[PDB]
Amino acid sequence: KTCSKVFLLENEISWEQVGEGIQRQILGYDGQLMLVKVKFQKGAIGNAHEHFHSQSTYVVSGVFEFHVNGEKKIVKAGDGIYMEPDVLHGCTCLEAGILIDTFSPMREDFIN
Amino acid sequence: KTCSKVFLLENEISWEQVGEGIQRQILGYDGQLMLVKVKFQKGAIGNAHEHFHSQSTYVVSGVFEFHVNGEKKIVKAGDGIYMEPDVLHGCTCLEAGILIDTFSPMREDFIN
Numbered sequence: 001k002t003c004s005k006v007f008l009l010e011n012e013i014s015w016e017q018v019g020e021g022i023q024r025q026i027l028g029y030d031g032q033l034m035l036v037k038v039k040f041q042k043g044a045i046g047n048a049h050e051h052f053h054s055q056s057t058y059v060v061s062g063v064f065e066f067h068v069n070g071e072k073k074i075v076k077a078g079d080g081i082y083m084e085p086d087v088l089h090g091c092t093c094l095e096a097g098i099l100i101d102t103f104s105p106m107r108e109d110f111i112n
Numbered sequence: 113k114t115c116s117k118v119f120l121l122e123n124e125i126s127w128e129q130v131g132e133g134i135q136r137q138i139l140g141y142d143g144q145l146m147l148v149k150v151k152f153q154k155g156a157i158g159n160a161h162e163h164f165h166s167q168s169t170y171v172v173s174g175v176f177e178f179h180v181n182g183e184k185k186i187v188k189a190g191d192g193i194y195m196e197p198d199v200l201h202g203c204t205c206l207e208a209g210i211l212i213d214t215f216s217p218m219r220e221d222f223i224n
């Protein structure tokens with residue numbers, strides 16, 4: 001049965017170390033939709049990558065420089081970013097904060 | 113061509129009035145994934161509803177009482193909620209704050 005629990009409580013879920021200055025919690029998901037909370041320290045880099053999944057991100061807090069398909073924009077709390085299937089994208093955290101990354105379908109690699 | 117722009121800047125997107133004390137911005141989406149930012153005043157109610165879409169929500173801020181399939185839980189900033197296809201769910205805002213609701217596939221009704 002491939003899905004998260006119903007209530008994903010931050011203080012009950014393990015933070016996974018993703019890289020230097022980057023930690024994440026996988027929150028609500030099934031095979032078609034996955035929501036990930038990613039906490040960045042200043043200076044941390046989301047390495048450029050491509051994947052077939054659709055991705056839609058929300059900036060909860062902090063300030064980030066994002067690039068999507070070669071285009072750069074600084075985004076801040078309240079802003080969103082859409083990454084169509086297979087587009088190159090990544091980010092650098094300018095001030096510590098949280099992103100919510102969402103995916104369709106799920107990122108099987110994030111649980112396996 | 114069914115999708116949002118790449119960079120969804122809060123100060124460039126219209127807030128839509130959804131109901132009493134509830135406003136939303138549709139952020140990054142395509143036909144398979146849609147991310148919605150929903151700002152609630154204290155007291156506001158997300159009416160109980162059912163839909164075939166998968167939904168995964170993140171509590172950005174505030175405090176909410178959620179019900180999913182008849183089960184109630186208070187959630188707060190950092191917590192998530194997963195709503196499998198067709199489950200009855202809704203919420204009441206106990207302290208003003210923001211939810212990110214994500215859907216697969218998109219909520220066609222939110223743009224049409």
Ligand SMILES: [Ca+2]
Binds near residue numbers: 104105144216217
């Ligand atoms: Ca799908």
Ligand SMILES: [Ca+2]
Binds near residue numbers: 055
């Ligand atoms: Ca990505």
Ligand SMILES: [Ca+2]
Binds near residue numbers: 161163167201
């Ligand atoms: Ca719903």
